[PDB]
From a paper:
Here we describe a comparative structure-function analysis of C10 bound to the envelope (E) protein dimers of the five viruses it neutralizes. The epitopes are distributed evenly at the surface of the icosahedral virion, which is composed of 90 E dimers organized in 30 “rafts” of three parallel E dimers (Kuhn et al., 2002).
Because C8 shows similar docking axes, the implications are that its expanded neutralization range is due to the same mechanism.
Residue numbers in the entry:
A (entry chain L), F (entry chain L): 0 to 95, 95A, 96 to 213
B (entry chain A), D (entry chain A): 1 to 151, 156 to 186, 192 to 339, 343 to 396
C (entry chain H), E (entry chain H): 1 to 52, 52A, 53 to 82, 82A, 82B, 82C, 83 to 100, 100A, ...
The structure:
């Protein structure tokens, strides 16, 4: 019967200077033995607070700890640019394992920005080699929730794609995504129209980018 | 006497001793028009009619999938394929399905599968656009008389090509009408009813769409939207069609303006720019003499919503038809009569008189003599 | 100050073995309980092992029991993690976490190592194939660049016009394909006014293979 | 042999010479469970069943307005009023309507009007919440045998109160099951069908709502949403009810998980934490001797999706039942058999053997002797 | 520099008359064509009158024909607008717009006066009634303050705690009621932690009536 | 036949530094005789450009003029804080009237911010005087599109309300609105429940604020 901490929300989108509150809910009572860590990529996680409300030495007084029942809340009074990162709870109730939550991402909130959509057909060189990769690009969009759907001629493609998203851009707080769909050139050349159709909040209705093979 | 006490009322008056006057009839309200030594006329746009509208796009709201076929291959032999994947009005999706010895394959793994269904539209809606070339306005002209009712009007038609008309006003002459049949919005027609909607709102409707051409076998763009594929546990893939979107559309059209359609003809609240020449309109009862007896009011004088006052008077003399003496005072001032040239036709029937009094305190005296009717009045103006 | 620094990461074949070390400075090492926390790619922190200040008792999470064993040289002020029978699932960044303790493993304030990466895979080192992100016509702005495919292991570095072109590029996170090889894409948007003026060249750098590839991209 | 070649497959093994093993059955997939000197068992959660669900809120989707009454007053005498304005299940709006001599009033202007209609729900939907106290899980346990099919299992029930069960496995003993019946989501039930939906999404549905109580005369909160008032030209005010929202809901539920309901019982894909005690499970065929003849494979050995290899062999000796010799090599190494204790029951019928080989190159030898079966194999691991 | 400055605004009764003047500096006035542009409350600019550099010909929009007359004293370097028979609809801000012209009224670059306001109404000057925006319980933040009603003409100035309380107040634009009188509201949100601590007082200032009213607000 | 210029969009909501384009469409061809004015409250309108593309002396080169057919566009290259104001087109085609467009408001775009809603019952003093004003307040919301609906007990109130909106706040670029509903105390006291229900983009479903009379 492991103790499991459930963090929420998964993503917390706030403008700088706003008050942030992140929740961690314990599978069972752990009484106060809960700690909040901040994780910025490239660095090790950094203990912000422990015993549910005590700050670790040297952390700013923005970071605040509260507990009621099994529900613990980390509160950031005013978000600084530095504070946009991922946050993990860890319980230390009785004995190991001192399990971690699954993390809450705190991101910069922005005005909705529709993506720029591009499609790239498989190159002649790679086609010579034996495989074909079509690449759909979504450029500089916020929020991150975005749906890329590959369409072959009359068919909706599934299980043959892979996505990759950049982290929020330092200058315009936006995201970009790249979906590549790879086929054996054998299967690639039995079909004519390749399209990616993008659904995003910034688009009044989805936008499709297509090409016909060989042209 | 057809537009007193209506909020939607416009006063347009012939400048500089004009014989002609410009009105913009916007359905709903009416326009009271005056020109010097002419009858005041109430003009309104009875209706706007449209026929033979061009369908700009057809959207499906109830579809049907038939002729469903499957093809799957096996974890070693690449991606499955169906010729229907390029046959049109066919909607399809690939998945992977778990394959092994039990369903027929040499080794184990996830194998390609594609399901393909033939899409067809069972019932559709149209977005038709309004040609200025088939509008047909009808205008009702009634003369702003004092004829009795507590408070029949002739009408004239305006096609876009035949843009001029003549309204015979019995007893007053012939009014000439020359109106100019002067919208990024579409008539959404569904199932013997219709609405008027913003057109990018229409173009963004998440529904399958073909173009306006009359071919009974069209290709439906974005068929996908009425077809759902479900491969939950990687054992099978099912396709089903969504069932009619009529209810969803109706809910999405509550705010839209509903439009009457009965037999290809559809009726609009339109706005028609127009103007009237009264060269052969000249008043009734200029032959008559002034009125020598006294006048007394049947009701209390009443201010209308636009500042004019409405007066019902009974004449109990015997000059049989007579012009009604009328002036205002500060201190004599000659009155502004919207009911042009009031005349008592008969001693029993009272008459209505609409008059615009000056701002502030004014005294309206009717009849001639010193026991003639005098009405103290104070016109306020506080809000535009 | 109080600090731990780790070493011993790298590439392991499946079923192979590797030992990670994590050396301590700035505190009496004997009085700190030590723990091993790992983080798999695109996943959360996993608390997996722990050992008391005296190394007289260990705890292993169920995921690593009987394969990993945690040990401690107090005289040499270091912590050890002997990982045996590595499965692909063990690919992760491993942190060692130290904290003063009066009870066996319980601690309050802690200190983390830098974190070392270990990657277990049958994949053999391979340079990347580089293909072009060919642009087309919009004459405003259009996108173009390079695609870096079928390489192992991480990482590659992709530069644009030898660094002269930095604004507007996005190098995407590598995605690891079913083949066990990596694949990423590096894109930039630039104005179609200057598609036929400035030659756009990408510099792909997979140093584990020492393959450096410049690819020029044009319609 | 029921879970080879399924993607959704979990391997859980009894640690430290355990007699008991923890599994979390998540419907869909299955769990292959091994403990030392015990039969391997495939366990899966066949279904989850719920009955007697508490309705948390009722939302109307088709309403009806009756008993409509109007009251208007006149420009001088203030705001109109109707007692129905405080009678419940009555929805109303005030407007102003143009008043004057023709419709009955002393002077002119805009006068107060209020229309009031009696609202009633014709057909509603329910948001019922799932009590952990009336779930009923059923688990199917089949023994991971080598019995023949190319590749019947006993089942056991778990109520929330009666949380323990015993599965008789004929020929292998009695497995004991003690599972713990371990969701901010609502069962939206509409018209003999049902969906599972996020609950603030349900609470924000723009529909009139009463509470779960069984009174046949409830008060509908936000009735207004199914009633539209139209006072276009200030001559009248009309009320009409919106007509059913069934279509709109269906369209809004395409993404929702559909749930089977037939007779108050509803079926869920549930997640049940559980664990099995095999204290009276001990293997079949430990009496038997080793197998002295040779073995040859009927098919090609096949890798499963989780790295184990599946081997079909025929034995053409005459020791009638016999334990199947089995080991792997680098260099001898003793093999890891998921099909615990393989034994040839009959020389005609082949047997299936699932085995986990080491990573890298390995040699699986079956039978005893030097012409015994040897299978070169190379297990790769490239992705988690 | 080139500039015009206007005067002559104020309150007029309906049917009354007022004359607006607009004096010119920094250019040879005779060579500029003059125009009158007005803007009614909550509405766009209306171009209503124009006059040539020599004042030998005028143009009047249909809205003001026969009531307003535009004139020009070139020797005294000023422009005049004699408005007669004012109706409530003429309430507006009036700008005079000047521009060099070779043709009658046509001009390219221009210069605008400051703009003067005229208000035509039967309403008589009246101080405002001040009523309290009483708060209630939320114990975070709650709203409270003053309501300034039935006053004429504009404007009023509303201050909060004699200026000590500025952050969080919203003084709303006056709305002109059917009575011809104005009505506005001034609100502030403050924390319920200090509802019974700090007395909140508003200062209403209708100087046309010279009524100054302090109203204290509390639950 | 007056020439009428139709400006669009009515409101143009952009973040600072974004490119702004405003359209003015002419009832009939005026060929190039179109001018763009900027109007900031308290000041007179200021001519930015004239003859459809010529800048007036001293205006920054951000402001740009274009014409095609009857459609004229004013373009701001990068919006400065100063440039948030109203913009008017004026035609000078042949002869007066040199009509103006109805204006386009250019405002600062922001993240959606739901309003704080408050209700204020008529005061005892004003009730003594003879009238009653209920006041619903919406505090610090963006965007400005917001619907206030007054509800008396079972009845939706109409024609008896008046709204007032502040201009965009200098610090958080947000709006606040005040709706007052006035009745004769006579009619006021025949009804029990007074509510305002607010619909806004920031609210997942409308929020109502009510009171019962006298309590
Ligand atoms: C798509 O599916 C239809 C079947 O329609 C289904 O019906 C129900 C029961 C469900 O199964 C749903 O999936 C569908 O709604 C295929 O068959 C067509 O429909 C019927 C048979 O089902 C055919 O009608 C036939 O017509 C006879 C007339 O004689 C012949 O005349 C011409 C001469 O060339 C010939 O072309 C024609 O096809 C006829 O064969 C008559 O006796 C009777 O009406 C009989 O039912 C219809 O003709 C079929 N269409 C064909 C054969 O093209 C469709 O074929 C299928 N589409 C394909 C395969 O492309
Ligand atoms: C709301 O409107 C209903 C009418 O229903 C409408 O019907 C159609 C035609 C449209 O007009 C729609 O607007 C509505 O759907 C009023 O009347 C009720 O319904 C019917 C009459 O229309 C009545 O049914 C009657 O019942 C008889 C039984 O005898 C009596 O028994 C008890 C003894 O006390 C008595 O209370 C009862 O009312 C009966 O009078 C029988 O002969 C026959 O069925 C007959 O139709 C029904 O009883 C009416 N309800 C009443 C009178 O309460 C509603 O009255 C109205 N609601 C109001 C006024 O509050």
């Amino acid at each position: 019967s492991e103790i499991v901490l459930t963090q929420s929300p998964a993503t917390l989108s706030l403008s700088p200077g706003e008050r942030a509150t992140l929740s961690c809910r314990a599978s069972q009572s752990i009484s106060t033995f809960l700690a909040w860590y901040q994780h910025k990529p490239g660095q090790a996680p950094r203990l912000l607070i422990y015993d549910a409300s005590t700050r670790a030495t040297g952390v700013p007084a923005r970071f605040s700890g509260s507990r009621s029942g099994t529900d613990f809340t980390l509160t950031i009074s005013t978000l600084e640019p530095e504070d946009f990162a991922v946050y993990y709870c860890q319980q230390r109730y009785n004995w190991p394992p001192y399990t971690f939550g699954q993390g809450t991402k705190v991101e910069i909130k922005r005005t909705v920005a529709a993506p720029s959509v591009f499609i790239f057909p498989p190159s002649d060189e790679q086609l010579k080699s034996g495989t074909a990769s079509v690449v759909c690009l979504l450029n500089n969009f916020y929020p991150r929730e975005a749906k890329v759907q590959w369409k072959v001629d009359n068919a909706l493609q599934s299980g043959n794609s892979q996505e990759s998203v950049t982290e929020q851009d330092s200058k315009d707080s936006t995201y970009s995504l790249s979906s590549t769909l790879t086929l054996s050139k054998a299967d690639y050349e039995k079909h004519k129209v390749y399209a990616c159709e993008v659904t995003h909040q910034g688009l009044s209705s989805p936008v499709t980018k297509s090409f016909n093979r060989g042209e | 006497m057809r537009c007193v006490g209506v909020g939607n009322r416009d006063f347009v008056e012939g400048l500089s001793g004009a014989t002609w006057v410009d009105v913009v009839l916007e359905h709903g309200g009416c326009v009271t028009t005056m020109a010097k030594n002419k009858p005041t006329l109430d003009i309104e746009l009875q209706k706007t009619e449209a026929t033979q509208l061009a369908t700009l796009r057809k959207l499906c709201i109830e579809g049907k999938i038939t002729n469903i076929t499957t093809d799957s291959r096996c974890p070693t032999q690449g991606e499955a394929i169906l010729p229907e994947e390029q046959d049109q009005n066919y909607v399809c999706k690939h998945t992977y399905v778990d394959r092994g010895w039990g369903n027929g394959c040499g080794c184990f793994g996830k194998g390609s599968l594609v399901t393909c269904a033939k899409f067809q539209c069972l019932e559709s809606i149209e977005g038709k656009v309004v040609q200025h070339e088939n509008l047909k306005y009808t205008v009702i002209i009634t003369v702003h008389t004092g004829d009795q009712h507590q408070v029949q009007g002739v009408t004239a038609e305006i096609t876009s090509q035949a843009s001029t008309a003549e309204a015979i006003l019995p007893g007053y002459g012939t009014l000439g009408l020359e109106c100019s049949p002067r919208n990024e919005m579409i008539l959404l027609t569904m199932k013997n009813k219709a609405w008027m909607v913003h057109r990018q709102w229409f173009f963004d409707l998440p529904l399958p769409w073909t173009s306006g051409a009359t071919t009974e076998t069209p290709t439906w763009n974005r068929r996908e939207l009425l077809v759902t594929f479900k491969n939950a546990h990687a054992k099978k893939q099912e396709v089903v069609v969504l069932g009619s979107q009529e209810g969803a559309m109706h809910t999405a059209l509550t705010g839209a303006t509903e439009i009457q359609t009965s037999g290809g003809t559809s009726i609009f609240a339109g706005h028609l720019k127009c103007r009237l020449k009264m060269d052969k309109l000249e008043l009734k009862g200029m032959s008559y003499a002034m009125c020598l007896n006294t006048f007394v009011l049947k009701k209390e004088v009443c201010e209308t919503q636009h500042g004019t006052i409405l007066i019902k008077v009974e004449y109990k003399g015997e000059d049989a038809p007579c012009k009604i003496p009328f002036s205002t005072e500060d201190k004599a001032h000659n009155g502004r009569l919207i009911t042009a040239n009031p005349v008592v036709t008969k001693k029993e029937e009272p008459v209505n008189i609409e008059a615009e009094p000056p701002f502030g305190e004014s005294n309206i005296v009717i009849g001639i003599g010193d026991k003639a009717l005098k009405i103290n009045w104070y016109r306020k103006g506080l809000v535009p | 100050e109080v600090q731990l620094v780790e070493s011993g990461g790298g590439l392991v074949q499946p079923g192979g073995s590797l030992r990670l070390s994590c050396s301590a400075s700035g505190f009496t090492f004997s009085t700190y309980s030590m723990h091993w926390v790992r983080q798999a790619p695109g996943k959360g922190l996993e608390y997996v092992s722990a050992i008391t200040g005296e190394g007289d008792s260990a705890f292993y999470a169920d995921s690593v029991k009987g394969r990993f064993t945690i040990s401690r040289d107090n005289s040499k002020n270091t912590l050890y993690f002997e990982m045996n029978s590595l499965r692909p699932e063990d690919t992760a960044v491993y942190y060692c976490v130290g904290g003063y303790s009066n009870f066996y493993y319980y601690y309050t304030m802690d200190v983390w190592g830098q974190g070392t990466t270990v990657t277990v895979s049958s994949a053999s080192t391979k340079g990347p194939s580089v293909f072009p992100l060919a642009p087309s016509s919009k004459s405003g702005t259009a996108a173009l660049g390079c695609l870096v495919k079928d390489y192992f292991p991480e990482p590659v570095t992709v530069s644009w016009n030898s660094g002269a072109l930095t604004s507007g590029v996005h190098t995407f996170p590598a995605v690891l394909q079913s083949s066990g090889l990596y694949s990423l894409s590096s894109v930039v948007t630039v104005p179609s006014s200057s598609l036929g003026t400035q030659t756009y060249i990408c510099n792909v750098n997979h140093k584990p293979s020492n393959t450096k590839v410049d690819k020029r991209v044009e319609p």
